[PDB]
Design a protein around this ligand. Sequence first.
Ligand SMILES: C[S@@+](CC[C@H](N)C(=O)[O-])C[C@H]1O[C@@H](n2cnc3c(N)ncnc32)[C@H](O)[C@@H]1O
Ligand SMILES: C[S@@+](CC[C@H](N)C(=O)[O-])C[C@H]1O[C@@H](n2cnc3c(N)ncnc32)[C@H](O)[C@@H]1O
Ligand SMILES: [Cl-]
Ligand SMILES: [Zn+2]
Ligand SMILES: [Zn+2]
Ligand SMILES: [Zn+2]
Ligand SMILES: [Zn+2]
Ligand SMILES: [Zn+2]
Ligand SMILES: [Zn+2]
Ligand SMILES: [Zn+2]
Ligand SMILES: [Zn+2]
Lengths: 265, 265
Amino acid sequence: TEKIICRDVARGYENVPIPCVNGVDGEPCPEDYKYISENCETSTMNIDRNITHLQHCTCVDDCSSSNCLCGQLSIRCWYDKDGRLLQEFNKIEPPLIFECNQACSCWRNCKNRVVQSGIKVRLQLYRTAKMGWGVRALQTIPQGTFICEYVGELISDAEADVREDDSYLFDLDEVYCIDARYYGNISRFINHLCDPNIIPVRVFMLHQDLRFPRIAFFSSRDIRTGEELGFDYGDRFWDIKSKYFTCQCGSEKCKHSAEAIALEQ
Amino acid sequence: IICRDVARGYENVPIPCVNGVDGEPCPEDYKYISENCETSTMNIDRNITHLQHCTCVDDCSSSNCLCGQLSIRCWYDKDGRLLQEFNKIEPPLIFECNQACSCWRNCKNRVVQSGIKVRLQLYRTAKMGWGVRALQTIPQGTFICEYVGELISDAEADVREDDSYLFDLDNEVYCIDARYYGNISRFINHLCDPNIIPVRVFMLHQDLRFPRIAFFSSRDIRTGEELGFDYGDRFWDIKSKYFTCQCGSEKCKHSAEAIALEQSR
Ligand SMILES: C[S@@+](CC[C@H](N)C(=O)[O-])C[C@H]1O[C@@H](n2cnc3c(N)ncnc32)[C@H](O)[C@@H]1O
Ligand SMILES: C[S@@+](CC[C@H](N)C(=O)[O-])C[C@H]1O[C@@H](n2cnc3c(N)ncnc32)[C@H](O)[C@@H]1O
Ligand SMILES: [Cl-]
Ligand SMILES: [Zn+2]
Ligand SMILES: [Zn+2]
Ligand SMILES: [Zn+2]
Ligand SMILES: [Zn+2]
Ligand SMILES: [Zn+2]
Ligand SMILES: [Zn+2]
Ligand SMILES: [Zn+2]
Ligand SMILES: [Zn+2]
């Protein structure tokens, strides 16, 4: 039986509920962490929040013209009229995206505000066969759609270095990390895929302190109903971890499986 | 109808501007912001581990809610209005629930963080420049709007030219200066018999230098009635050398006549 074990792991903090189900085993809803919808701090990071340091636009239309200074910070605004990344978006080396902010003359519903508007797609936390908890789509999601943000505790590299559990760490290449082990959102449950269907993009919204980009996941292709979400964790993860477990993504493209490791040797 | 929404879509509802009185254009000598801003290093304590928080598994309507107890009790009724018993002369500090609390985002202790719900309008008054009025009946105890602006130290406030849009945060001490950056509250006129009252509130941080200032109706308010709060004795002590109060109430405390009588007493 597939059991509904939490109606909403976000406790009403997201735009939509994110339920949890388990049809595999008796493991209950995960509660060894604190669900947070926005990045938190546990020591002073001194993020630059001075409103006069913001780059900002002078638009009073919907920010769809090429005169929008905010879009010009990434050559162009990369969102189409429905908030999706443009077909030609560089999915290998994404540019930094500067969304409109409180210093801009535009309205809060201009076309340069996708990530700040939050989760719209319907996601579900579920028990996988071989990779613990994972996150899947409850609906068809077109290419270039914003899925969720990678949220957690902002920490220094020095702090990352003394922590035991490094399995929920995202690198913001002083250098910083988001650690989602103790505090995080739905993204902490997203597994690694060697054939990923989401891509991380660095985004700026309410501040433009370049040390602390916010990490937004967008679909890299059309995603089918029921499909598990996954991003490429990267080489730093697997260089550390492959000595202890191998990739179970099951793809013919898999480059971190025991069979992939044996073939390289 | 000279502006559909002075807030540019930043609030839950629009705040239109009208002028049926004179030729004054919609005010634009300030920047509308929905949340307080900084123009110097303030380092508001955002450390999540410094939040007092509750362990409630209900809607935080019980007297056992720690957050309510920090506030003496929770003063919100089931509809988010202050209890008739609320102290309107010397209001307590309110601690709303927050991201560290175990409760849901829809708990009964989250009125101010949920934002504006009443229909307001920026309008041209007969004798007092711009003012703010209600476009609906508003029961006693309803959250109206927050006093939002630029956070400055007493030192910075001590050297600023225009002190007409300043609110003191007496806890070091600090001020909100709404002259250059501010929300709809910057346009609210002074009343010696006010229909709204300021309350110090804590939501996403509990840095005691920076309570957020939330106005609640002190009585039932009729449609079209102008909002007003009592600016207080410091304001009038400084300004009465230039002008005196024109609220016109029999309860007026800061007219030329009231001040003459004060000197007699
Ligand atoms: C950030 S967590 C993801 C959520 C995790 N599955 C859980 O149940 O909490 C990362 C951990 O999930 C597991 N995992 C993620 N992707 C994997 C993959 N492709 N193969 C094997 N294990 C994986 C590993 O234990 C990894 O250290
Ligand atoms: C914060 S502003 C209020 C909005 C202002 N009416 C405007 O048009 O921008 C405060 C100023 O409004 C005027 N004002 C507000 N209430 C008043 C009152 N009851 N009596 C006299 N002047 C008042 C004074 O010039 C005061 O310094
Ligand atoms: Cl710094
Ligand atoms: Zn623009
Ligand atoms: Zn814009
Ligand atoms: Zn902009
Ligand atoms: Zn793989
Ligand atoms: Zn509670
Ligand atoms: Zn609560
Ligand atoms: Zn609480
Ligand atoms: Zn008066």
